[PDB]
Design a protein around this ligand. Structure first.
Ligand SMILES: CCS(=O)(=O)Nc1ccccc1F
Ligand SMILES: CCS(=O)(=O)Nc1ccccc1F
Ligand SMILES: [Zn+2]
Ligand SMILES: [Zn+2]
Ligand SMILES: [Zn+2]
Length: 585
């Protein structure tokens, strides 16, 4: 028994073909079964023929005869069809409203999440369907990880390097950081975990959560988890107040945080507020400063990633009493300077998926572009708060959508929060970039911030661009552009100061090649988000949708504090780079 996800209508029916088994009301369950391939229907029992060795599960082909269910062939003389009168049979048949269109719920229930339009709908549908879609999508995502073949240690060529043997008749996952494995050792009558791991082409290079002397017969699977059902909305109902509510501002504030006092007041005058913080505009400074501006307030700092929460902890360590901080960790190495798992501490730092059920004066959800509607709902379910602050930048990178291949995901579709920021705009904006030379700020201001991002620094005159397509090679799941690495090799011989530079590309394989040939440290654009470096050398590698995504490019070039060399494939983004052009040697 439960609630019709389309009506709320009290019901005893869940669609059994739907991977999430949503409750559907006689009306909505019917309109669902007759307009899709979904025909299995679950109640207190499953609407299946209880005849001995009959394979009828279609509810349109079944009858209640006795207190048991039968097809045409097996039914008793006295029976009524389970599925008639524009309704499917079960409890609470008299209380049932239906819907004018069930189109959206069908699309969500039946889509394979490979098309952009699938994620668009999960984001523009009604709120109750945003939760359904969010569960359905995450469950699909975690089942797609089982489709992957087991990798097994066939030889241990060295340390940090392995030879893998791969399960037959199953695909192998891409070997980049976005796929995190879990090793296992071959025991008497079972298997025990041996840390999480990642891999990159060699043989294969492996960067594991722990060190070991791992040996042959050890194997690896992408660990998938149970997806719990969602209750809370992605956003609580907005409220605007006429005075700061449930928060007492400080009388004395430092000139370090004085620029955010207007914004901290806004935070107190609405139920939830959105802060767009471009690169190096001071998001974590903002988040910690709120604590000092409302000193007596209980604040739960949350984000999807351990890294994001840890970065909030690092900043907190610099400004807030340590004795008033706690880091929530469930029973990966993260921040270990606060007392661990003290829920009742004034300042709680904690990933979304580890949150305790608790209340608070403020909740700060950081790096909001990475969040999914699943994470949004979870926060609202675990944390009942006077005020919610969502800090991030919808011009930066979303969570990877492992299933998505057809279409690009626009920032207004990353989650309910980025939707608000891209349609009504953000409640608050950090409009001065402190990190980047002005040439990079001028470029991303035009490119993604509507000319509202200002440069703190001057021009470095150390921002260069080269238009060089070179030669693209493709391996199993990545791209390589050796001639673009060649151009950088040659650039470094003539400009050896740049040997302090980080190498960034949109592809892990390009990175692997560049590390051998250049020996710069390397990052994927995606791994670089939230880091800065004095000098960045960036090879676009290809002119794909991946390598031209304006959000990725934005993250790539705003990593630089002083200078950047962009070797570009795409004439479009090259022409948008407000950098010094260089000819090809
Ligand atoms: C009131 C008893 S019955 O009408 O035979 N049962 C039924 C079954 C499916 C839909 C509607 C129904 F009413
Ligand atoms: C919500 C359960 S959890 O995911 O285990 N995270 C947590 C929460 C509070 C104390 C200790 C904890 F570990
Ligand atoms: Zn269904
Ligand atoms: Zn219904
Ligand atoms: Zn039968």
């Amino acid at each position: 028994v439960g609630a019709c996800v389309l009506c709320n209508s009290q019901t005893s029916l869940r669609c059994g073909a739907c991977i999430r088994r949503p409750f559907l009301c006689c009306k909505c369950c019917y309109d669902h079964v007759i307009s899709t391939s979904h025909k299995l229907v679950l109640s207190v029992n499953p609407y299946v023929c209880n005849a001995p060795g009959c394979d009828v599960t279609d509810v349109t082909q079944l009858y209640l005869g006795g207190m048991s269910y039968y097809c045409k062939s097996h039914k008793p003389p006295i029976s009524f069809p389970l599925c008639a009168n524009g309704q499917v049979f079960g409890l609470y048949k008299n209380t049932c409203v239906g819907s004018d269109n069930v189109t959206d719920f069908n699309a969500i229930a039946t889509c394979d999440w490979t098309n952009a339009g699938d994620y668009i709908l999960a984001n523009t549908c009604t709120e109750r369907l945003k939760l359904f879609a969010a569960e359905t999508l995450k469950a699909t995502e975690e089942t797609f990880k089982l489709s992957y073949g087991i990798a097994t240690v066939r030889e241990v060529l060295s340390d940090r390097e392995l030879h893998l043997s791969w399960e037959v008749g199953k695909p192998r996952p891409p070997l980049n950081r976005n796929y995190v494995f879990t090793g296992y050792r071959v025991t008497k009558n079972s298997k025990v975990q041996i840390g999480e791991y990642t891999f990159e082409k060699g043989a294969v290079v492996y960067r594991g959560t722990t060190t070991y002397k791992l040996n042959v017969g050890d194997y690896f699977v992408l660990t998938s988890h149970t997806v719990m059902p969602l209750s809370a909305p992605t956003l609580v109902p907005q409220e605007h107040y006429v005075r700061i509510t449930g928060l007492y501002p400080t009388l004395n504030i430092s000139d370090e945080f004085s620029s955010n006092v207007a914004n901290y007041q806004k935070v107190g005058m609405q139920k939830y507020s959105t802060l767009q913080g471009p690169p190096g505009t001071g998001k974590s400074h903002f988040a910690i400063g709120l604590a000092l501006y409302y000193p007596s307030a209980r604040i739960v700092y949350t984000a999807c990633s351990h890294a994001a929460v840890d970065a909030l902890c690092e900043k907190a360590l610099k400004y807030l009493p340590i004795d008033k901080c706690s880091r929530i960790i469930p029973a990966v190495e993260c921040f270990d300077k606060f007392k661990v798992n003290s829920t009742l501490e004034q300042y709680v730092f904690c990933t979304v998926n580890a949150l305790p059920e608790t209340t608070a004066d403020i909740v700060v959800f950081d790096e909001i572009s990475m969040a999914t509607n699943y994470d949004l709902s979870v926060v609202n379910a675990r944390l009942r708060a006077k005020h919610y602050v969502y800090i991030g930048d919808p011009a930066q990178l979303p969570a990877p959508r492992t299933l998505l291949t057809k279409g690009t995901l626009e920032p207004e579709y990353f989650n309910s929060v980025c939707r608000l920021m891209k349609t009504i705009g953000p409640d608050m904006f950090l409009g001065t970039c402190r990190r980047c030379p002005a040439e990079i700020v001028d470029t991303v201001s035009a490119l993604v911030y509507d000319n509202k991002l200002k440069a703190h620094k001057d021009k470095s005159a150390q921002c260069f661009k080269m238009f060089y397509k070179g030669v693209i090679t493709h391996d199993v799941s990545s791209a390589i552009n050796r001639p673009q690495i060649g151009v950088v090799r040659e650039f470094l011989t003539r400009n050896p100061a740049w040997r302090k530079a980080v190498f960034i590309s949109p592809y892990n394989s390009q990175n692997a090649v560049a590390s051998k040939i250049l020996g710069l440290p390397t990052q994927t654009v995606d791994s670089s988000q939230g880091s800065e470096y004095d000098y960045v050398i960036f090879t676009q590698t290809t002119e794909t949708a991946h390598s031209c995504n304006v959000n990725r490019f934005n993250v790539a070039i705003t990593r630089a504090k002083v200078g950047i060399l962009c070797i570009m494939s795409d004439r479009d983004l090259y022409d948008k780079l407000q950098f010094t052009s260089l000819e090809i040697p």
